[PDB]
């Protein structure tokens, strides 16, 4: 499906961003 | 069918009584740290922290020196060397201000746009790359580490009227922009030309050279269409390789460049076709300047309307009709909701209004 394929791209790409965020320690406001 | 449900736990009104055009949660804050959001409107930038039992705690209130400034947008970033959070704001003056959110000092500003700035977006991988979209018909890419203007997206085949919105894709390889000329334009930034311009902006050192940095003038987009909407396009976001965009026709359109099976990275700049995949219908949102938003995981889509209703859709439901959640309404929320923002964990959804009110909805 066009939907399942696009959802898989979103899942894998947001997981890449989420792992980059997990490695970070930004100071709180 | 959608299962997402929310409860309105709190509301407040900023004492300036002016419309609030922007709201953003700081998605850079680490897990466990307090959920912080910024609001912008009038010549004001206000920071709040979310606490238990719907508490919205006022942290700091920035008031621009220029009383006639009208902020339209804000975006969070962080200093890549010290991990300190940063907030960029801009509006009617066409001036970008980088503020230290801890002290409310304006660290620095960027001048160059010939008119108002409608939206600011930070690159999803590089926190120094700031994109601004303007009423001057152009987009500008800035490197806020070296204070350089990397590229200006506009000219011969750029927008022919005010640019209202833009969005980077998830990995930051490309930008889709839209505006008053009814068009949606793609600008690749992973081209050999743009990757080299970005690298050159990092090598620029003023205390090592007296020549000014030369910006790229990108006159031609990688795709362009005026066939999605029949009026101004005031909001655009990527949904994976697909696009979500809206005009005043009470629908958010899900579409993609080229034919159904065409790969986004293989579409040629002269591609004349578009494929509509679906529409998210709503009502009473036919006025200009009404932004839709998504959560981090792109599982929820939210949009406020002109009478205070907040629509939410479950993006994991293929058919957009069955994707509709229960609309979020409060009998005291009757002004236009200009923008919404989900917290990083999707547990909180904040809406801001024309009457300076802020509404907090917690996910159940
Ligand atoms: C006070 N009432 C009655 C009149 C009114 C005046 C100004 C604007 C306005 C909002 N916003 C922007 N730009 C930022 C922007 C772009 C796209 C989508 C949205 C935006 O923010 C809200 C959601 N303006 C630019 N010029 N006038 C604007 C809207 C209404
Ligand atoms: Cl942001
Ligand atoms: Cl060019």
Report DSSP letters for B134-180, one per residue.
Answer: ETTS-EEEEETTTTEEEEEE-STTS-SS-EEEEEE-TTSSEEEEEET
Task: Round to whole Å and give the CA distance between B131 and B187.
Answer: 12
Nearest to B254 by CA among B216, B280, B231, B273: B280
End-to-end CA distance of chain A: 43
Looking at the DSSP assignment, which residues form a beta bridge with residue B324?
Answer: B313
Nearest to B119 by CA among B168, B72, B175, B169: B72
Mutate: best of B125, B240, B265, B342, partner A, most A CBs <10 A: B240
Q: Is the CB of B304 under 6 A from ligand 1?
A: no
Report whether B232 contacts B180 (CB < 8 A): yes
CA distance A1 to chain B (A): 10
Tell me which DSSP letter residue B324 carries: B
- Tokens at residue B325, please? 């959640």
Resolution limit in angstroms?
1.8
Nearest to B242 by CA among B269, B262, B222: B262
Task: Round to whole Å and give the CA distance between B295 and B298.
Answer: 5
Three-class secondary structure of residue B208 per DSSP? helix
The answer to whether the CB atoms of A29 and B124 lie below 8 A apart is no
Method: X-ray
Find the chain B residues whose C-beta atoms sit closer than 8 A to any C-beta of A: 26-31, 33-34, 36, 47, 49, 59, 78, 82-85, 101-102, 124-125, 170-171, 239-242, 260, 277, 296-298, 316, 318
Ligand 2 geometric centre to CA of B24 (Å): 5
Contacts (Cβ under 8 Å, ≥6 apart) of B182: B226, B229, B230, B231, B232, B233, B247
Sort strands B216-218 and B148-153 into parallel, antiparallel or unpaired.
parallel
Cα atoms in the 13 Å half-sphere on the side-chain side of B91: 23
């Amino acid at each position: 499906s066009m939907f399942s394929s696009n959802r898989q791209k979103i899942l894998e790409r947001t997981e890449i961003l989420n792992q980059e965020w997990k490695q970070r320690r930004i100071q709180p406001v | 069918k959608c299962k997402y449900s929310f409860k309105c736990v709190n509301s407040l009104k900023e004492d300036h009584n002016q419309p609030l055009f922007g709201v953003q949660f700081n998605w850079h804050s680490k897990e466990g740290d307090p959920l912080v959001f910024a609001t912008v409107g009038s010549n004001r930038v206000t920071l709040y922290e979310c606490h238990s039992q719907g508490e919205i705690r006022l942290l700091q209130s920035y008031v621009d020196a220029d009383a006639d400034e009208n902020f339209y947008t804000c975006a969070w970033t962080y200093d890549s060397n010290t991990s300190h959070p940063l907030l960029a704001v801009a509006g009617s003056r066409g001036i970008i201000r980088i503020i230290n959110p801890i002290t409310m000092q304006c660290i620095k500003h960027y001048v160059g746009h010939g008119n108002a700035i409608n939206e600011l977006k930070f690159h999803p991988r590089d926190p120094n790359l700031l994109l601004s979209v303007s009423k001057d018909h152009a987009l500008r890419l800035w490197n806020i580490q070296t204070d350089t203007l990397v590229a200006i997206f506009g000219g011969v085949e750029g927008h022919r009227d005010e640019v209202l919105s833009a969005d980077y894709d998830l990995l930051g390889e490309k930008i889709m922009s839209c505006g008053m000329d009814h068009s949606l334009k793609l600008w690749r930034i992973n081209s050999k030309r743009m990757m080299n311009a970005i690298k050159e902006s990092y090598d620029y050192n003023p205390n090592k050279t007296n020549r000014p940095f030369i910006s790229q003038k990108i006159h031609f987009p990688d795709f362009s269409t005026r066939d999605i909407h029949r009026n101004y396009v005031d909001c655009v976001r990527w949904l994976g390789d697909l696009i979500l965009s809206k005009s005043c026709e009470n629908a958010i359109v899900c579409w993609k460049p080229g034919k159904m099976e065409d790969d986004i990275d293989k579409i040629k700049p002269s591609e004349s076709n578009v494929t509509i995949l679906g529409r998210f219908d709503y009502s009473q949102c036919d006025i200009w300047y009404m932004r839709f938003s998504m959560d981090f995981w792109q599982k929820m889509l939210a949009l406020g309307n002109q009478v205070g209703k907040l629509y939410v859709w479950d993006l994991e439901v293929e058919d957009p009709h069955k994707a509709k959640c229960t609309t979020l309404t409060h009998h005291k929320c009757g002004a236009a909701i200009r923008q919404t923002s989900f917290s990083r964990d999707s547990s909180i959804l904040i809406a801001v209004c024309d009457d300076a009110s802020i509404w907090r909805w917690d996910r159940l």
